[PDB]
Structure formats: structure tokens, C-alpha cells
Structure 1
Amino acid sequence: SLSSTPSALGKLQDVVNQNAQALNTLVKQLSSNFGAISSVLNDILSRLDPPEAEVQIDRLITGRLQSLQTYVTQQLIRAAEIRASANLAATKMSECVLGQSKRVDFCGKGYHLMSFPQSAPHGVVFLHVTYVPAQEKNFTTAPAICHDGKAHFPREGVFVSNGTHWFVTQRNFYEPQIITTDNTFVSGNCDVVIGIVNNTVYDPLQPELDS
């Protein structure tokens, strides 16, 4: 993916291109008259006596000082931008390479698992290993299940139904489980919840008590 795509490291090459363009413009601004008789100090000095050469030399000085000031100001602005990007990169390295971040889309499209740093010219490349769900399936769901006079809510999961029986799974992976008392908790009766369905919550102690 990195090799086939031509402009993969576009933002890393833009730094080099911008620096080169700025330096080339600064060099080329040394060939401008700025109003003087010539853009070469030696030509001004070798043709004019000092009282009249001072005017042209002052014009050249003003123009070149303006060019240098423009270069320094744009470099300060660009350095502020690069500092912001480097602070973001340092935060990303701290929170994603040295840990696991719960922030959404901070370190990739999907649930973050890990990240790997790779140095690159004038920057860093993070490879974000993430978890993406796939192969969804539609089930019938219920907020709670009404046992004999009691309302049962899933402890850590969700109630689904494959058409006739009811299971409790985890919300990020279809792992149906038999709805038992260790899977759910009771929070009242079957009157307040809107959408509560009738089912049976198996108790993993009655078979032991029978025998």
C-alpha cells in the first residue's frame, strides 16, 4: 500500500518541498534591483562615488532586509505548525504505542488494539493494528426477560433470539449463552420495563438440589 500509491508520504515530502522553495526564493531575491541601478553591490561601488552610491546601497539593503524578514516570519509560522504536528505525534506515541487508547478514531478506524512506530524522513509513521467487526447478523432483542414475577437484565451482554429460544451474548461478538442466573441480575418486576419478554432463566443449583 505504501509503495504502490505514489503520494503516500505526501505530508512528509511537503516539508522538504516547502523548505526548498523558501530557500530558493530567498536566494533568487538577491537578483532584484529594488529600485537601485543594479542588483550587484560591486557594480554600484565600482561605478559611483560613495555619496551617490550610498543611495543605491541603501535601496538594496532595504529590499534584502525585507526579504530576510519575510523568510524568518514564514519560517516561524511553519515552525509553529510543525511543533503542533510533533506534539500530536508525541501524544499519539504516548497513548497508542505505550498503551491502548479508548479514544475513537484517534489511532485508526476501528477498536484500537496496538500501534507500531516507524521512523521516516522528518517524521513518524504509526501502523495502527485495530479490530473491525464483520459478518453481522440480525436477531430479535429484548431489554429484559420476565422470569416468575421478576425482571432479569444481562450483567455484561445483550439478549438475542435465534427465532425460538433466547440467549445472552457479548455485544461485540456472537457467542450465544444459555440464560442463567450467573448471566443476569434482577431489578424488580415485569411492569416498568417497556419491551420485556417472557422466558425462563435457568438456575444452576436446582439440578444439584434434586440429586
Structure 2
Amino acid sequence: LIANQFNSAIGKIQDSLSSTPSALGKLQDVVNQNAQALNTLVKQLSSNFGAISSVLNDILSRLDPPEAEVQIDRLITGRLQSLQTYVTQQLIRAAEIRASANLAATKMSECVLGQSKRVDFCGKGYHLMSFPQSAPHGVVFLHVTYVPAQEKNFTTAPAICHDGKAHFPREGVFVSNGTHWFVTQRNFYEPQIITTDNTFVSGNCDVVIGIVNNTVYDPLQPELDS
């Protein structure tokens, strides 16, 4: 069942990537931002910047060099301002991209190379795996996560008062299906008959607020009889 769910989930990722065109929004936005920055930088050559000519080869021909020098100064001031603006934007974008790349390296390390217990760091749910996929100027992670589906109400109590002493679950939760009491792990309903193997005694019944009377099965007692 889990293998089928994993295969079907990967197939659904395949289909969703195939159909929806806005899936790779981050990479597309980065590429488009860089492209439009380059296009703006190139188009800045066509602006006069106060010079009577936006093309440098005409201002040197129509005007004498002693007078054309001030127009060249205007053009160089404008183009240098354009380059400084472009470089500042590029440096800020590169800082953002470096932060994203550090995050991608961290996600690779903690999810491809291990299982991360950080909540919602790698996928929504109890993280299981992660499969990197290359992409143009980026990376794509297929965060395999464990998501519980079908919950069921139960009656629970912090402890279990047996033989005049509190019993707490070694690992799990005391639950009852109305009449009988069971200890169940915290993430998957697997009722277990109450026993000293999976419960540890921790004092008397008076202190606990919420204790309920019950019985705790003793594994060794039947072998004592037989």
C-alpha cells in the first residue's frame, strides 16, 4: 500500500508539473528578473542623459572635440549611473540568490542526506525523504512526507491506576474504545492490551489528576500457574 501511494504521488507530481505552467515560478521569476535587468541596461544606451545625442559617434562628428567633451561627460555620467544601478541591483539579487542557495544546500544536507525533524522544513507533514531534481538555475525537491488521514475519537487518561499504583505508558497513549482500555502509539491507531512491558509504574494513584481505574496484564503470572 505504501509503495503504491509513493508511486501514485510521484505520478501525480509528474502530471501536475506537466499541466500547470506556473509551477516553476521561482526559477522563471529569477530568469525574467535577470533578463529584464539586462534589457534595461542595454536600452539605457538609447537615452540622451542630457546630451544632445544619444549615440556617441554622432556627437563626436557633428561637434568639435572641445565642445563635444562636455556632451561625452554627460553621456558617461549617465551610463556610469546606469552601470552602478545595475551592479547594485545585481549584488542585492545575488545576495538573495545566495541565501536561497544556502537554504537549498541545507535542505539537501538535512533531507536528501538525512531525515530532518524540523517541522515544515522539508514538506508539510512528518518528513520522510527528499529527492533532488536539477532545474535551470535552481533545484527542485520532491519532499516525501507522512500525513495522517483518518482520525478517530477516543477516550484517554494520563495514567492507569492498577494495584494501587499509577501506570504510565512507556511509549504510546492510553485509549479506550468505550469499554476496554488500550495503549496506542501516538501517530497510528494500533491498540495494544495493557501490560507491564509497555507501561512503567511511577508512584501511587492519589497524585495524578485524571487517572482511571483499570487492570494491567502480568506476562509472567500465567507461566507461574503452568
Measured against the shorter chain, the TM-score band is over 0.9
Query: Which residue number in structure 2 is paired with residue 180 of structure 1?
Result: 195
Deviation at 1:36, TM superposition (A): 1.2
TM-score, with length taken from structure 2: 0.92
Percent of pairs identical after alignment? 100
Aligned partners of 1:61 and 1:135: how far apart in 2? 69
Aligned partners of 2:57 and 2:224: how far apart in 1? 110
Would you tell me which structure has more helix in proportion to its own residues?
2
DSSP 3-state at the match of 1:132: strand
Deviation at 1:49, TM superposition (A): 1.4
DSSP 3-state at the match of 1:42: helix
Aligned partners of 1:36 and 1:113: how far apart in 2? 63
- Alignment partner of 1:206 is 2:217: no
Aligned partners of 1:172 and 1:35: how far apart in 2? 71
Query: Which residue number in structure 2 is paired with residue 40 of structure 1?
Result: 55
Query: Which residue number in structure 2 is paired with residue 89 of structure 1?
Result: 104
Aligned partners of 2:56 and 2:169: how far apart in 1? 86
**How many residues are paired up?**
211
CA deviations on 1:63-105 (whole Å, 9 max, x unpaired) are 1111111111110110000000000000000000000000000
Q: Which moved more, 1:198-207 or 1:40-49?
A: 40-49
| Structure 2, unpaired ranges of 5+ | 1-15
Aligned partners of 2:25 and 2:36: how far apart in 1? 16
Deviation at 1:51, TM superposition (A): 1.0
Deviation at 1:40, TM superposition (A): 1.3
Deviation at 1:41, TM superposition (A): 1.5
Aligned partners of 1:107 and 1:140: how far apart in 2? 33
TM-score, with length taken from structure 1: 0.98
Would you tell me which structure has more strand in proportion to its own residues?
1
Query: Which residue number in structure 2 is paired with residue 106 of structure 1?
Result: 121
CA deviations on 1:113-147 (whole Å, 9 max, x unpaired) are 10000000000000011101111111110111111
Deviation at 1:6, TM superposition (A): 1.8
Aligned partners of 2:137 and 2:195: how far apart in 1? 57
Aligned partners of 1:186 and 1:60: how far apart in 2? 86
Aligned partners of 1:134 and 1:71: how far apart in 2? 50
DSSP 3-state at the match of 2:148: strand
DSSP 3-state at the match of 1:131: strand
Deviation at 1:201, TM superposition (A): 0.5
Aligned partners of 1:36 and 1:205: how far apart in 2? 100
Aligned partners of 2:50 and 2:160: how far apart in 1? 89
Aligned partners of 2:18 and 2:161: how far apart in 1? 58
Aligned partners of 1:46 and 1:145: how far apart in 2? 99
| Structure 1, unpaired ranges of 5+ | none
Aligned partners of 1:103 and 1:192: how far apart in 2? 35
Deviation at 1:33, TM superposition (A): 1.2
RMSD: 0.8
Deviation at 1:160, TM superposition (A): 0.4
DSSP 3-state at the match of 1:175: coil
Extract structure 1 runs of 4+ deviating beyond 2 A: none
Query: Which residue number in structure 2 is paired with residue 195 of structure 1?
Result: 210
